């Protein structure tokens, strides 16, 4: 009969459904593919870290050609470069320029700090854009470092300065009027964003008062 053979066909199916669920199940057990977003982070971490050809205050054009042009020429407003590597986002980027990025690490004073090396925090307070501007900001920030754990106090000096594209280096000094203010030099070049090799200097001679390897925050 009609009713019949059907009663089992629906079974052969109710079957497959299970042999499959017992699969989709054994699937979830095995993890989810890491978020291309992972590889990307590797290629990054890696890429940040080898020499570049250029002697100082020249930087290479972003793109395929190596070619080295002097740091200064940015910007014409126009593509200094033939390549126009510039025009590409990785150069004109928002995040890069973006203000109110903060970097911290554990400052261990060669010089000052009798006490046990304390937390240093150099954070950006404002930095000039205009519209177009592919380039490096000329900026203001704050350098804060704990007095103590005990004291629960903390020094906060205001700074002025810029960021060198070519150098990958952040150079800040006390704004003024303090006459002793302290300043700070942070080198990018892991190649990473986040990470920098900062050193608290004396705004005079640019002599290293203390050193701290920083991360963002």
């Amino acid at each position: 009969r009609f009713q019949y053979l059907v009663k089992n066909q629906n079974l052969h199916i109710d079957y497959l459904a299970k042999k499959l669920h017992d699969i989709e199940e054994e699937y979830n057990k095995l993890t989810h593919d890491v978020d291309k977003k992972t590889i990307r982070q590797l290629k990054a971490r890696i890429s940040n870290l080898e020499e570049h050809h250029c002697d100082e205050h020249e930087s290479e054009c972003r793109g395929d050609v190596p070619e080295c042009i002097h740091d200064l020429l940015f910007c014409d407003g126009e593509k200094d470069c033939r390549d126009g590597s510039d025009e590409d986002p990785e150069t004109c980027s928002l995040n890069i320029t973006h203000v109110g990025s903060s970097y911290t690490g554990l400052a261990t004073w060669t010089s000052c700090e009798d006490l046990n090396p304390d937390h240093a925090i150099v954070t950006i307070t404002a930095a000039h854009r205009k519209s177009f501007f592919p380039n490096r900001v000329w900026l203001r920030a704050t350098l804060s470092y704990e007095l103590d754990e005990h004291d629960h106090t903390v020094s906060t000096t205001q700074l002025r300065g810029f960021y060198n594209f070519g150098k990958r280096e952040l150079l800040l000094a006390p704004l003024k009027g303090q006459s002793e203010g302290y300043g700070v030099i942070c080198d990018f070049n892991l190649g990473d964003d986040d990470h920098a090799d900062c050193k608290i200097v004396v705004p005079s001679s640019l002599f290293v008062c203390a050193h701290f390897n920083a991360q963002r925050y």
Binding site: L5, Q9, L16, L20, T31, L42, P117, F212
Partner: protein, 220 residues
């Protein structure tokens, strides 16, 4: 009636072969874990990325950046505030845990007469305290497969030693053997856990007689 229903089967029979072939794919898929491969590269690269710190000092985590003396830092209680150690990922016993067998090729400078060959370090036993992270005392069996005049022979000696959590080092010295075949030494950071870089050395000399790169053999 009979056609649309008897044919709706040639449709189902298909899913049967499909679902089956699909099983084979789920088997192929388990062999390439991406999340695994990526980890290989991470470790592979981290391996490339020296110490700032001084030797037999412990580098803290991201937050600060400080050096701590090894013995002090692996108190077993928290060395530091944070603490780097306390976080479960490092302390995790399992990966570390011995009982593993490690094999690999031992290329000699040729302090030993004998041609290159394979060594097979296999952890016999391992005491600590109940907890006990820092230090792991252990006994192990070191074999080699070398040819004498005549057929394939196997030189096994028994060894005693320790594993230094921080050191990422496994030191195996001979017991009291007449052979007293020279002491093996392996370090962790391959960046795999599995894998280790070893060397045969003499105690007194504390020279390196041979290079040996081992890999944990699968238990199954």
């Amino acid at each position: 009636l009979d056609p649309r229903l008897g044919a709706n089967a040639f449709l189902i029979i298909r899913l049967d072969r499909i679902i089956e072939k699909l099983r084979t794919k789920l088997d192929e898929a388990e062999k390439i874990d991406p999340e695994h491969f990526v980890s290989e590269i991470d470790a592979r690269v981290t391996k490339i990325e020296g110490t700032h710190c001084e030797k037999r000092t412990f580098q803290c985590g991201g937050n600060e950046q400080e050096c701590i003396s090894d013995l002090l830092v692996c108190d077993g209680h928290k060395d530091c505030h944070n603490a780097h150690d306390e976080d479960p990922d490092v302390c995790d016993t399992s990966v570390v845990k011995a009982g593993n067998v490690f094999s690999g090729t031992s290329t000699w400078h040729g302090c030993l007469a004998r041609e290159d060959h394979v060594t097979r370090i296999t952890i016999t036993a391992s005491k600590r305290r109940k907890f006990f992270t820092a230090r792991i005392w252990l006994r192990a069996l070191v074999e080699s497969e070398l040819e004498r005049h005549g057929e394939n022979v196997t030189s096994s000696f028994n060894a005693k030693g320790y594993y230094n959590f921080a050191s990422r080092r496994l030191i195996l010295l001979p017991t009291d053997d007449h052979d007293d075949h020279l002491a093996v030494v392996c370090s962790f950071n391959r960046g795999d856990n599995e894998r280790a870089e070893c060397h045969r050395v003499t105690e007194a000399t504390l020279h390196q007689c041979a290079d040996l790169f081992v890999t944990l053999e699968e238990h199954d």
